[PDB]
Amino acid sequence: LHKEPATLIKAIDGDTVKLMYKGQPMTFRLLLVDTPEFNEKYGPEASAFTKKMTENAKKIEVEFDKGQRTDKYGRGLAYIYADGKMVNEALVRQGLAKVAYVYKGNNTHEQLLRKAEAQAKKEKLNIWS
Ligand SMILES: Cc1cn([C@H]2C[C@H](OP(=O)(O)O)[C@@H](COP(=O)(O)O)O2)c(=O)[nH]c1=O
Ligand SMILES: [Ca+2]
């Protein structure tokens, strides 16, 4: 897997962000996670968490997995990095996301994220409290 440049256009919610990728605006959905919706418990905290992460990054990187790169809504599917920290992993680690939507061929960081979830669960963080 390769890291590719992109710039923040706009924070959206816990697991979607609007980025400019190869010069085009695109909504990206974070692979392998599910944040609660804004209208649900920990929804605002997940949105805030991702927002802060992407807005404070001097460098945003997009990492496609081996499989599908856009979903049926035309959202990009990627691992998103903020100054080298993976947002996907960070949300899970803090119990603001569950590991989810694990489809074969788009699951490289699956284990990493389950490990993060296991530790978030252990600590009864946020969604696990
Ligand atoms: C994360 C992810 C979501 N999706 C689709 C599946 C879900 O379909 P449905 O909308 O039909 O439920 C939806 C979940 O995204 P949201 O959690 O952003 O709603 O987006 C994928 O197709 N591939 C993926 O890797
Ligand atoms: Ca969601």
- Torsion-angle region of 127 (φ positive above 0: left; ψ -120 to 50: alpha; else: beta): alpha
- Would the annotation count 34 as a binding residue? yes
| Nearest partner of 15 among 72, 76, 74, judged by Cα | 76
C-alpha–C-alpha distance, residues 59 and 54, integer Å? 9
Cα(first)–Cα(last) distance of the chain, in Å? 34
Q: Please, which residues have CB within 8 angstroms of residue 118's CB and are 6 or more apart in sequence? A: none
Specify the residue with its C-alpha closest to ligand 1, atom 11.
72
Instruction: Give the residue carrying structure tokens 């980025």.
Output: 19
Amino acid at 35: T
Residues 29, 109 contacting (CB under 8 angstroms): no
Residue where the block lists tokens 């692979």: 31
Cα distance between residue 108 and residue 104, in whole Å: 9
Assign 104 to helix, strand or coil: coil
- Ligand 1 within 6 A of 71 CB? yes
Residue 35 in marked binding region:
yes
CA of 72 to the centre of ligand 1 (A): 8
For the chain, the domains span: 1-129
